[PDB]
Write a protein that binds this ligand. Structure first.
Ligand SMILES: COc1nc(-c2cccc3c2O[C@H](CNC(=O)C2CCOCC2)CO3)ccc1Nc1cccc(CN(C)C)c1
Ligand SMILES: Nc1nc2c(ncn2[C@@H]2O[C@H](COP(=O)(O)OP(=O)(O)NP(=O)(O)O)[C@@H](O)[C@H]2O)c(=O)[nH]1
Ligand SMILES: [Mg+2]
Length: 172
């Protein structure tokens, strides 16, 4: 029966420049990317142990704005869980979260899709989104909220591991 470790397909979504790539590269390479090189689509893989279970994370790092609609629908269909990322110094990115979540719910035709709300750049001083407002949004969705910094690494492992735990709860 066991043919190899369990694989989880994770998709990182959110507005341009919120730190999707930086979060992922911090997880994979333990490296902070200071440059802003806009992504088209990149795939990463990492084996980790979460709650005593070995797993392979297949992580799709997406473009903030994806014009080809058909490619976007494809990764939403294939993804098992979604990190919905905003930047705590960018109110507009926070307002956009609702739109990412709606699109995902429509493609998966479900109210109950594994997701984590991620407030990134929590190292920066010019916060415009209060922690309490983000926590309230996440509570309204029934999903976890995690504050992260791709720079300091605060919350980075937690965000990805929490998402895996959400997928597991959903599969059971
Ligand atoms: C392609 O398989 C993967 N898939 C995902 C993945 C995770 C979550 C959702 C996904 C994903 O890819 C899917 C594969 N893509 C598609 O089917 C595309 C093909 C072109 O038209 C549009 C659809 C789409 O949705 C993430 C990582 C990998 N793969 C990967 C990552 C890093 C390293 C390697 C190994 N390589 C460097 C030797 C493989
Ligand atoms: N101080 C700080 N800067 C960050 C953080 N995360 C990302 N950045 C910076 O924000 C800029 C954008 O990051 P990047 O990961 O490219 O964002 P993205 O969401 O992948 N953009 P795209 O959607 O175009 O692919 C980069 O200059 C990066 O260094 C963080 O937690 N703290
Ligand atoms: Mg990127």
């Amino acid at each position: 029966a066991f043919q190899g470790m369990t694989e989880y397909k994770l998709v990182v979504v959110g507005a341009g420049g919120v730190g999707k790539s930086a979060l992922t590269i911090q997880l994979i390479q333990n490296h902070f990317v200071d440059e802003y090189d806009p992504t088209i689509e990149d795939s990463y893989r990492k084996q980790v142990v979460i709650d005593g279970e070995t797993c392979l994370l297949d992580i799709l790092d997406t473009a903030g704005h994806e014009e080809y609609s058909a490619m976007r629908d494809q990764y939403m269909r294939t993804g098992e869980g979604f990190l919905c990322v905003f930047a705590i110094n960018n109110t507009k990115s926070f307002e956009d979260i609702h739109h990412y979540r709606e699109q995902i719910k429509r493609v998966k035709d479900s109210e109950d899709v594994p997701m984590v709300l991620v407030g990134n750049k929590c190292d920066l001083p010019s916060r415009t989104v209060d922690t309490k407002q983000a926590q309230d949004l996440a509570r309204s969705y029934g999903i976890p909220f995690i504050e992260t910094s791709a720079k300091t690494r605060q919350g980075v492992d937690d965000a990805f591991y929490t998402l895996v735990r959400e997928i597991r709860k959903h599969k059971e």
